[PDB]
Amino acid sequence: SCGCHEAIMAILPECNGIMITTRDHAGMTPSGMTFSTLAGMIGGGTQTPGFMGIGRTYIVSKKFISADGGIARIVWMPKSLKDFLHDEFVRRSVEEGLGEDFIDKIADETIGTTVDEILPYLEEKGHPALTMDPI
Protein backbone atom coordinates (compact mmCIF):
# COMPACT_ATOMS: atom_id res chain seq x y z
CA SER A 1 0.00 0.00 0.00
CA CYS A 2 2.44 2.61 1.26
CA GLY A 3 5.69 1.18 -0.22
CA CYS A 4 7.57 0.36 2.98
CA HIS A 5 8.89 -2.89 1.30
CA GLU A 6 10.33 -0.97 -1.66
CA ALA A 7 13.74 -1.77 -2.95
CA ILE A 8 15.54 -1.12 -6.16
CA MET A 9 17.78 -3.58 -7.97
CA ALA A 10 20.39 -2.68 -10.56
CA ILE A 11 22.71 -4.69 -12.70
CA LEU A 12 26.45 -4.24 -12.13
CA PRO A 13 28.02 -5.76 -15.24
CA GLU A 14 31.57 -5.37 -13.95
CA CYS A 15 30.68 -7.46 -10.80
CA ASN A 16 28.77 -9.93 -12.99
CA GLY A 17 25.75 -9.48 -10.71
CA ILE A 18 23.22 -7.14 -9.07
CA MET A 19 23.16 -4.55 -6.34
CA ILE A 20 20.10 -3.79 -4.22
CA THR A 21 19.23 -0.70 -2.31
CA THR A 22 16.28 0.38 -0.19
CA ARG A 23 14.20 3.50 0.66
CA ASP A 24 15.55 3.81 4.21
CA HIS A 25 19.18 3.71 3.00
CA ALA A 26 20.55 7.23 2.51
CA GLY A 27 23.91 6.14 1.11
CA MET A 28 25.47 6.13 -2.35
CA THR A 29 25.45 2.84 -4.19
CA PRO A 30 27.71 1.26 -6.87
CA SER A 31 25.19 2.26 -9.58
CA GLY A 32 26.26 5.87 -8.98
CA MET A 33 22.83 6.72 -7.49
CA THR A 34 21.08 6.69 -4.13
CA PHE A 35 17.73 4.90 -3.65
CA SER A 36 16.16 8.33 -3.70
CA THR A 37 17.70 9.30 -6.99
CA LEU A 38 16.97 5.84 -8.47
CA ALA A 39 13.34 6.20 -7.47
CA GLY A 40 13.22 9.65 -9.04
CA MET A 41 14.71 8.24 -12.26
CA ILE A 42 12.08 5.45 -12.69
CA GLY A 43 9.22 7.26 -10.98
CA GLY A 44 6.83 8.42 -13.71
CA GLY A 45 6.35 4.98 -15.27
CA THR A 46 9.74 5.54 -16.88
CA GLN A 47 11.11 1.95 -17.04
CA THR A 48 14.88 1.90 -17.55
CA PRO A 49 16.82 -1.13 -18.68
CA GLY A 50 19.07 -2.66 -15.91
CA PHE A 51 17.01 -1.16 -13.09
CA MET A 52 13.94 -2.59 -11.37
CA GLY A 53 11.76 -1.82 -8.36
CA ILE A 54 11.11 -4.92 -6.21
CA GLY A 55 9.69 -5.79 -2.81
CA ARG A 56 12.50 -6.38 -0.29
CA THR A 57 11.14 -9.89 0.50
CA TYR A 58 11.11 -10.99 -3.18
CA ILE A 59 14.89 -11.25 -2.55
CA VAL A 60 14.40 -14.25 -0.25
CA SER A 61 11.81 -16.02 -2.39
CA LYS A 62 12.68 -19.29 -4.23
CA LYS A 63 11.88 -17.73 -7.63
CA PHE A 64 14.13 -14.69 -7.17
CA ILE A 65 15.76 -14.13 -10.58
CA SER A 66 15.97 -17.92 -10.47
CA ALA A 67 16.97 -18.87 -14.01
CA ASP A 68 19.89 -16.39 -13.81
CA GLY A 69 21.32 -17.75 -10.57
CA GLY A 70 19.11 -16.47 -7.85
CA ILE A 71 20.52 -14.78 -4.76
CA ALA A 72 24.06 -15.90 -5.78
CA ARG A 73 23.95 -12.82 -8.11
CA ILE A 74 23.63 -10.35 -5.23
CA VAL A 75 27.02 -8.59 -4.85
CA TRP A 76 25.99 -5.54 -2.92
CA MET A 77 23.31 -4.58 -0.41
CA PRO A 78 23.11 -2.14 2.46
CA LYS A 79 24.12 -3.56 5.85
CA SER A 80 20.68 -2.52 7.12
CA LEU A 81 19.08 -4.79 4.52
CA LYS A 82 21.37 -7.71 5.43
CA ASP A 83 20.41 -7.33 9.04
CA PHE A 84 16.75 -7.03 8.27
CA LEU A 85 16.54 -10.11 5.97
CA HIS A 86 19.30 -11.96 7.83
CA ASP A 87 17.53 -15.14 9.06
CA GLU A 88 15.52 -15.72 5.86
CA PHE A 89 18.55 -14.78 3.75
CA VAL A 90 20.82 -17.25 5.53
CA ARG A 91 18.26 -20.07 5.34
CA ARG A 92 17.92 -19.27 1.61
CA SER A 93 21.68 -19.24 1.07
CA VAL A 94 21.84 -22.70 2.64
CA GLU A 95 19.00 -24.03 0.47
CA GLU A 96 20.79 -22.77 -2.61
CA GLY A 97 24.01 -24.60 -1.66
CA LEU A 98 25.88 -21.32 -1.08
CA GLY A 99 26.61 -21.94 2.58
CA GLU A 100 25.45 -20.03 5.68
CA ASP A 101 28.20 -17.37 5.34
CA PHE A 102 27.34 -16.40 1.74
CA ILE A 103 25.83 -13.14 3.12
CA ASP A 104 29.30 -12.20 4.36
CA LYS A 105 30.75 -12.54 0.83
CA ILE A 106 28.33 -9.84 -0.29
CA ALA A 107 29.69 -6.31 -0.22
CA ASP A 108 27.98 -3.48 1.59
CA GLU A 109 28.47 0.24 2.42
CA THR A 110 31.16 -0.60 5.05
CA ILE A 111 33.16 -2.04 2.19
CA GLY A 112 32.54 0.64 -0.39
CA THR A 113 30.02 2.44 -2.58
CA THR A 114 31.67 1.99 -6.00
CA VAL A 115 32.52 -1.00 -8.17
CA ASP A 116 36.28 -0.26 -7.85
CA GLU A 117 35.89 -0.15 -4.06
CA ILE A 118 33.95 -3.47 -3.79
CA LEU A 119 35.37 -5.61 -6.56
CA PRO A 120 38.61 -6.56 -4.69
CA TYR A 121 36.50 -7.60 -1.70
CA LEU A 122 34.23 -9.75 -3.92
CA GLU A 123 37.39 -11.24 -5.44
CA GLU A 124 39.10 -11.88 -2.09
CA LYS A 125 35.94 -13.51 -0.60
CA GLY A 126 35.47 -15.70 -3.68
CA HIS A 127 31.95 -14.42 -4.49
CA PRO A 128 30.28 -17.00 -6.80
CA ALA A 129 28.82 -14.32 -9.09
CA LEU A 130 32.31 -13.50 -10.41
CA THR A 131 32.64 -16.96 -11.98
CA MET A 132 29.01 -17.53 -13.09
CA ASP A 133 27.91 -17.01 -16.71
CA PRO A 134 27.56 -13.40 -17.85
CA ILE A 135 24.72 -11.54 -16.14
**Residue numbers 3-62 binding Ni ion by CB under 5 A:** 4
Q: How far is the CB of 131 from a copy of itself (least distance, A)?
A: 9
Query: Is 50 part of any known ligand binding site?
Result: no
Q: What long-range pairs does 119-123 form, CB within 8 A, spacing at least 24?
A: 119/14, 119/15, 122/15, 122/75
Question: Which does residue 93 bind out of a copy of itself, Ni ion, none, counting CB within 5 to 8 angstroms by kind?
Answer: none
Residue 68 vs 96, nearer CB to a copy of itself = 68
Residue 97, classed as helix, strand or coil, is: coil
Query: Is 15 part of any known ligand binding site?
Result: no
Residue 89 vs 121, nearer CB to Ni ion = 89
User: Cβ(74)–Cβ(64) under 8 Å?
Assistant: no
**Rule CB under 5 A: is residue 1 a binding residue for Ni ion?**
yes
User: Cβ(132)–Cβ(16) under 8 Å?
Assistant: yes
User: Cβ(103)–Cβ(87) under 8 Å?
Assistant: no
- Binding-site residues from annotation: 2-4
- Binding-site residues from annotation for Ni(2+): 2-4
Please give the residue ranges that form the binding site for Ni ion (CB under 5 A). 1-2, 4
